[PDB]
Design an enzyme around this catalytic site. Sequence first.
Site, PDB file in Angstrom:
ATOM      1  N   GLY A 223       9.549  39.956 -51.902  1.00  0.00           N
ATOM      2  CA  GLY A 223       8.711  38.782 -52.031  1.00  0.00           C
ATOM      3  C   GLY A 223       8.934  38.002 -53.310  1.00  0.00           C
TER       4      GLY A 223
ATOM      5  N   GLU B  36       7.841  48.335 -61.444  1.00  0.00           N
ATOM      6  CA  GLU B  36       6.614  48.154 -62.194  1.00  0.00           C
ATOM      7  C   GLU B  36       5.661  49.313 -62.016  1.00  0.00           C
ATOM      8  OE1 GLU B  36       4.795  44.234 -61.746  1.00  0.00           O
ATOM      9  OE2 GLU B  36       2.759  44.989 -62.093  1.00  0.00           O
TER      10      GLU B  36
ATOM     11  N   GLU C  98       3.338  32.118 -66.453  1.00  0.00           N
ATOM     12  CA  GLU C  98       2.923  33.132 -65.470  1.00  0.00           C
ATOM     13  C   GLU C  98       2.834  34.533 -66.078  1.00  0.00           C
ATOM     14  OE1 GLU C  98       1.421  32.151 -62.693  1.00  0.00           O
ATOM     15  OE2 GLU C  98       1.963  30.160 -63.469  1.00  0.00           O
TER      16      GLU C  98
END
Length: 445
Positions: free
Chosen positions: A415, A248, A293
Site C-alpha cells: 500500500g 516497522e 507526514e
Amino acid sequence: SVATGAVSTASSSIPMPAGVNPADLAAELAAVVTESVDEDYLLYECDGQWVLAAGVQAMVELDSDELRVIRDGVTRRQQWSGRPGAALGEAVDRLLLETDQAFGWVAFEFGVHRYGLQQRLAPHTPLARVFSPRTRIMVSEKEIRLFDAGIRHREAIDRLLATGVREVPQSRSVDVSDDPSGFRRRVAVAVDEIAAGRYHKVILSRCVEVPFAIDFPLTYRLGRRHNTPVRSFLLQLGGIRALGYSPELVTAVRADGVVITEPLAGTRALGRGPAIDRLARDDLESNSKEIVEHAISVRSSLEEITDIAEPGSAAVIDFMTVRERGSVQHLGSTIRARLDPSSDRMAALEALFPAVTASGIPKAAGVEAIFRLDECPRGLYSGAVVMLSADGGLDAALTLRAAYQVGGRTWLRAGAGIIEESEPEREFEETCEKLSTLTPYLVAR
Ligand SMILES: [Mg+2]
Ligand SMILES: [Mg+2]
C-alpha cells in the site's frame, strides 16, 4: 536479549559454527522439524535471535463473535464483549501461566473496535491467533538455544550442522504492473475525500496474485539475504502460510517496563546503485511532503504512547532518519517510554495499533475510509505478528512486505499513504517499489 527474565532454559547452548547463517539455519530447521511430523510453527526474528516456535500446545482463537481456547483436541468456547485486547490478554495470560512465551498474529480488524467500527465486520471475522509452542529453538550468530526440545529436534540440528543447509534454488518472476483492483481509481476517490476535508491521510493497498505455489522457507531465506527488516517471520498456522520482512515495529514492551515504538513515513526506492540511492536518500531526508507526514506521525505516536506511559517518560531518541528496508528506504523515528503501573502490554498494543502506516490521519477516519476504499477484511496484512512472554513482554511487528497462502491462493499486498497532493501514478509506483522487497525472490514449490 529475547531470552531474559522468565524466558529461560537450563539447557546448554550449542555454539554456532563459523560459516553458518542464523536465518538460513532457522528456516531450514522450520522446514525439517515440521515436515516429518506435519506440525504448525512460527519463526520470529527479533534483535539477532531467530525464535522457532514449533508445535501447538494450546491455541487462543479470537474472532469478532467469540473466543476459543483449543488444547489436546478440546475446544472451550466463550462469548466476549468490550475491548478485543482485554479478551485476548486474559486468555493469553492463562497460556503464559504454563509456558514462558506465546506467539501468533493479530489481524488489521483487531484495531477497529477502539473506533466503534466493529459492527461493520462480517460474522466470524478472525481478529487474532496466539499459541503456546511445544518446543522453541533460538538461533543467533553466536549460538543455538533449546527450550523443551526433544531428541528429534536435536537430531535435526545435528544433521543440518553436519551436511549444511540446502542451496536456495533459482527464483521465478511475477508481474506486478497490472491493476485489476483499480488501485489508481480508488486513490483518486481518497484524494477527493481529503480535498473535501474528511481526513488528512489514508493508506490504501492492492493485492498481487502469485500464479504459482511458492516454497515458504526457501523464499524466506532468499528474501532475507536481500533485506534488512526490523523483524521478520515465517509461519504455518492453521489454514495460513506467511512470510514477511516487517519494516516497522508497532510496539515492544519489555518486562523491565521499557516501551518502544518506531513509526515510519515516506518512501524512496533503494537497491538501484550507490549514487542513485544516495540521491533518493538525500531527497527523502529533505523533502517537504515526506517531512510533514513524518512529523505528523511522530506527533500521533507521542499522543498514544503518552496515554499508556508514566508521565514525563515519553521521548524521541532518534528523530527522522533514513531507515533502509531492502527495495525501499523510509523516514523513521524511535520513541521510548516507561509503561505506567495502571497500564499493561495489551493496553500498550491497543493504544499504538493500528499503526499510522496501516490506517491514516486521523487514525479513526483512516480506518473508516479503509472499510469503504480498500479490499476488506485485510486479515494479516497491516496487522501484526507478535511474541509475548510470561513476565509481561510483548513484541509486535507490523505485517507489511509479506507473502500469504490460504487454500490455493498465494498473494502479495502493498500500500501507500495517500495525501491531498497525491498523484495516483506515483502512489501505484510506490506500491511496486514496496512489492520489489519480495518479487525478485519467490522460489516456486
Ligand atoms: Mg492522551
Ligand atoms: Mg505517502
